[PDB]
C-alpha cells in the first residue's frame, strides 16, 4: 500500500513536491529536474519537448498526499 | 557488508521483479553485488531462437536511472542486433534512454528483438538477414541448438 | 557516499573500446586475442621501447590473461617477444607479479592499459636501461 | 464521504475530468470550460489571464479518483 | 431539494458550522433563499445593532453572483436607500470559486472597513466628516438595528 | 427557478431605469426609501390612431406582500374613460383585464403597463370620448 499512483515516475517512491507537465504527467519535482539538466529537455515519458520553466506545482496531488500521509504516515 | 546502501528505486524494482517476474525471463540480483543481475531469456515461440535459453547479464550503473542500464548477452546468438561480443543494439540502450523506463521495460524490449529481428540498423548478420532470410533463420535456428541448449 | 563496483565483463568491454579507440602516442596498445571470445579472457598487448634506453624502439608484444576476479585480482602477463628485464622470466617471459609493483599492489582501479604503461616506465628504471637484450624480434619458444 | 481535495473548485462534486491550470489549480473540465466562456478568461482562484488551451489534463488525479471510486466505492457517473 | 448539489453542500457546511457573528438559513420551500443577520462588528459604528439581510442564488449561480440585499436601514457609504450593497464580488468582479461564506465574510469586513474612497451622498459626508458620520451611523444603528425580530 | 418577492422587484427596478427606450410604457419606485418597495409609478403614452394620442397617463401600482405570485393593484392618476377603468377614481378592475384577470407569475409592471396601450387600441376604446387633457382624479 503506497499505491503506484503516488509515485515519481522517475523516482518510484512517494512524491514529495508533485509537478505536472504539459503533456500532463506528474513527477517529483527534484527528479524531473535532474532529468532535465542531465539527460536533456524533454518529457521522460512522452518525449515531448520540455523545460524547467514549463513545470507546474500539481497542488492537488500534494493534498492527495498530505491526506494519505497522516492517515498512514510511512 | 549488509546488502543496501542501495537506491530505493533499485530496491523496489528488484522486488517487484522477483514478485511478478516477466513471463519467460528469469532475472535475479547477484547475491554478492545488488546492482548486477543474472538474466536468462527463453527463446520466444515462433522466433528462430525457439528452442533454447539465453544468458544475459544486466547492470546498474551508478546514475541509473539517469543512465541506462547495461546489458549484454552471454550466450552466443546469431542476430542482427547482437554482436560477437553479445553487445546489444537498442535505441533505449543508446539515447532513446529515459529515466521513466526501467529494468522491466529493458527486459521486455530485449525479448521483443528476439521476436522482430531488426535487420536494417544498419553488419554482416544484418546483411545476410535482408539478402537471404531462409539461411539467416536456419543458421540462428542452428546456433540456438549449438549454444543455447542446456547451459542448465 | 563514494560507491558501486563495475563487474568484470562490463569493465572489460570498456577496456575493449578504449583499447581500440585512442591510445596516447602509438606507445602501448591492447585488444582481444580472439574477437569472438565472449568470455573476454584472453588479450594481447604491445609496447614500444622507450627512448634513450636499450629498449629504444623495438616493439614488444605480450600476452594478457584475465580471470574470473579481474579486476579485483590482477591479470597474468607474459612477454612473447623475448626481453631481458628484471621481473620477467628469461626462460618463458612470464611476469612475475611479486616484485613488479603495479601488480604487486594492484587496485581494482587498475587496467591493462595501466600495466602496459607501467612495464614501460620500468624499461626506464636505471636497473634495466643498459641491459643486453637478446636479438631483436625473437620470441620465447613454445 | 468525498474528500474535498477530490472536487471542483467550482463544482464542489468529485471531479470527472480534472484539468490543472497554469498557476495550477484543478477543476473539472466541464466547469472551468464554462467559467471561461461565461465569466472570464482568468483563473477562478488566482485570476491570472487564463485561456482554455492553457488547460492540461491532470491524469494523476484522474487516477487517484478511480482508485477511490473503487475502494471507498460511492455514488455515480460514466 | 431537486436542485444542484453544490448548493445543498454549501448549506450543511454553513448551518453545521456558521460564522463568528453571522446567522444564515434557508427558508422553507425557497431552498435558494437565505435569511441572515449580521452582528454589528465589535468596535464598529454599528456595534449595538443586528442586521437583517437577505440573499439569494439565481439560476445561473455559481456562474452568476448571488443577489444580496440588506433589509435594515444603515448609514454606510456602500449601502444605499434600498440596501443595495455594493461590492465588486457582487457586481462584475465575482468568480465561481468564491462562495456564500465568502460573501457573508466580505459584507462583514465590509462593516468595520467602511469604504468611502469610493464614493452617492453618504459617500461625500461620510469621508468629509469621518466621526461626524459615526454619530449618524450609531444613532442609525440605535434606531433600526436594536429591537427588530 | 423561484425568484422571491424582493429581488424580483429589485429586477423591475433597475430594469425600469434602462426602459424599452421606444418611449411608451415606463416605470418607477414612488419613494426610494421604501425598502418594501411597495409602491410604484407607471406611465403610458398614447397609442396613435386612437383618441389617446400621445397622452401622458400616470398610474400608480402597488405590490403586495405576495407578488409576483398575486397580481398587483393598479390604478389611474390621469383621468380616463376606458373599459374597466372605474371612472370615479381611476381603479382598474382585474376581472376584465386578462393580464390581471388571468395573471401569471411571469408577468410584471412593463407587462401590465403595456397591455393597457394594447387595450387603448382595442376598437372598444380608440373611439370613446375623453376627459379634457391631463385633468384628473381627486383623492
Swiss-Prot record, chain A:
Keywords, sorted A to Z: Cytoplasm, DNA damage, DNA repair, Isopeptide bond, Mitochondrion, Nucleus, Phosphoprotein, Repeat, TPR repeat, Transferase, Ubl conjugation, Ubl conjugation pathway
Annotated U-box domain residues: 1-74
Observed phenotype of the null mutant: 95% of knockout mice die at birth, surviving mice have decreased longevity. Reduced levels of CHRNA3 ubiquitination in the brain.
PTM per Swiss-Prot/TrEMBL: Auto-ubiquitinated; mediated by UBE2D1 and UBE2D2 and enhanced in the presence of MAP2K5.
Residues in cross-link Glycyl lysine isopeptide (Lys-Gly) (interchain with G-Cter in ubiquitin): 30
Induction behaviour: Up-regulated by inflammatory signals in Treg regulatory T-cells (Treg).
Major place of residence: cytoplasm
Residues carrying Phosphoserine: 48
Gene Ontology terms: biological process: cellular response to heat; cellular response to hypoxia; cellular response to misfolded protein; chaperone-mediated autophagy; DNA repair; endoplasmic reticulum unfolded protein response; ERAD pathway; MAPK cascade
GO CC field: cytoplasm; cytosol; endoplasmic reticulum; mitochondrion; nuclear inclusion body; nucleoplasm; protein folding chaperone complex; ubiquitin conjugating enzyme complex
Keyword hit for Lyase: no
Effect on the protein of changing residue 44 to A: Loss of E3 ubiquitin protein ligase activity
Entry's localization field: Cytoplasm; Nucleus; Mitochondrion
Entry GO MF terms: G protein-coupled receptor binding; heat shock protein binding; Hsp70 protein binding; Hsp90 protein binding; kinase binding; misfolded protein binding; protein homodimerization activity; protein-macromolecule adaptor activity
Keyword rRNA-binding attributed: no
Source taxon at top rank: Eukaryota
Known tissue expression: Expressed in the brain.
Protein name in UniProt: E3 ubiquitin-protein ligase CHIP
Gene name tied to this protein: Stub1
Swiss-Prot record, chain B:
Domain UBC core: from-to ranges: 5-149
Catalyzed chemical reaction(s): S-ubiquitinyl-[E1 ubiquitin-activating enzyme]-L-cysteine + [E2 ubiquitin-conjugating enzyme]-L-cysteine = [E1 ubiquitin-activating enzyme]-L-cysteine + S-ubiquitinyl-[E2 ubiquitin-conjugating enzyme]-L-cysteine
GO molecular function: ATP binding; RNA binding; ubiquitin binding; ubiquitin conjugating enzyme activity; ubiquitin protein ligase binding; ubiquitin-protein transferase activator activity; ubiquitin-protein transferase activity
CDD domains noted in UniProt: UBCc_UBE2N
Biological processes, Gene Ontology terms: antiviral innate immune response; DNA double-strand break processing; double-strand break repair via homologous recombination; negative regulation of TORC1 signaling; positive regulation of canonical NF-kappaB signal transduction; positive regulation of DNA repair; positive regulation of double-strand break repair; positive regulation of intracellular signal transduction
Keywords from the named record: Acetylation, ATP-binding, Cytoplasm, Disulfide bond, DNA damage, DNA repair, Isopeptide bond, Nucleotide-binding, Nucleus, Transferase, Ubl conjugation, Ubl conjugation pathway
Gene Ontology CC terms, in alphabetical order: cytoplasm; cytosol; extracellular exosome; nucleoplasm; nucleus; protein-containing complex; UBC13-MMS2 complex; ubiquitin conjugating enzyme complex
SUPFAM superfamilies: UBC-like
Subcellular location(s) of the protein: Nucleus; Cytoplasm
EC number: 2.3.2.23
Chain positions with N6-acetyllysine modification: 84
Cross-link (Glycyl lysine isopeptide (Lys-Gly) (interchain with G-Cter in ISG15)): 94
Effect of residue 94 to R: No ISGylation
Regions crossing the membrane: none
Pathway: Protein modification; protein ubiquitination
UniProt organism field: Homo sapiens
The encoding gene: UBE2N
Swiss-Prot record, chain C:
GO annotations of cellular component type: cytoplasm; cytosol; extracellular exosome; nucleoplasm; nucleus; protein-containing complex; UBC13-MMS2 complex; ubiquitin conjugating enzyme complex
Domain of life: Eukaryota
Residue ranges of domain UBC core in the record: 7-142
Location(s), subcellular: Nucleus
Tissue specificity comment: Highly expressed in thyroid, pancreas, spinal cord, lymph node, trachea, adrenal gland, bone marrow and pancreas. Detected at low levels in heart, breast, placenta, brain, liver, kidney, stomach and lung.
GO MF entries: ubiquitin conjugating enzyme activity; ubiquitin conjugating enzyme binding
Keyword tags: Acetylation, Nucleus, Ubl conjugation pathway
Factors inducing expression: Down-regulated during differentiation of cultured colon adenocarcinoma cells.
InterPro entries: UBQ-conjugat_E2_core, UBQ-conjugating_enzyme/RWD
Function recorded in the entry: Has no ubiquitin ligase activity on its own. This type of poly-ubiquitination activates IKK and does not seem to involve protein degradation by the proteasome. Plays a role in the activation of NF-kappa-B mediated by IL1B, TNF, TRAF6 and TRAF2. Mediates transcriptional activation of target genes. Plays a role in the control of progress through the cell cycle and differentiation.
Family membership: Belongs to the ubiquitin-conjugating enzyme family.
Name of the protein this chain belongs to: Ubiquitin-conjugating enzyme E2 variant 1
Organism: Homo sapiens (Human)
Organism taxonomic ancestry: Eukaryota, Metazoa, Chordata, Craniata, Vertebrata
UniProtKB/Swiss-Prot annotation, chain F:
Keyword Lipoprotein attributed: no
Miscellaneous comment as given in the Swiss-Prot or TrEMBL entry: In human, PESD1/KUA and UBE2V1/UEV1 are adjacent genes which can produce independent proteins and can also be fused to form a PESD1-UBE2V1 hybrid protein.
Family from the record: Belongs to the ubiquitin-conjugating enzyme family.
Organism of provenance: Homo sapiens
A single cellular component GO annotation: UBC13-MMS2 complex
Compartments, record wording: Nucleus
Predominant place of localization: nucleus
Name assigned to this protein: Ubiquitin-conjugating enzyme E2 variant 1
Assembly and interaction partners: Heterodimer with UBE2N. Interacts (UBE2V2-UBE2N heterodimer) with the E3 ligase STUB1 (via the U-box domain); the complex has a specific 'Lys-63'-linked polyubiquitination activity. Interacts with TRAF6.
Lineage: Eukaryota, Metazoa, Chordata, Craniata, Vertebrata
Tissue specificity as recorded in UniProt: Highly expressed in thyroid, pancreas, spinal cord, lymph node, trachea, adrenal gland, bone marrow and pancreas. Detected at low levels in heart, breast, placenta, brain, liver, kidney, stomach and lung.
Function: Has no ubiquitin ligase activity on its own. This type of poly-ubiquitination activates IKK and does not seem to involve protein degradation by the proteasome. Plays a role in the activation of NF-kappa-B mediated by IL1B, TNF, TRAF6 and TRAF2. Mediates transcriptional activation of target genes. Plays a role in the control of progress through the cell cycle and differentiation.
A biological process from GO: regulation of DNA-templated transcription
Pfam families linked to this entry: UQ_con (PF00179)
Top-level taxon of origin: Eukaryota
GO MF term (any one): ubiquitin conjugating enzyme binding
SMART domains documented for this protein: UBCc
Domain UBC core stretches: 4-139
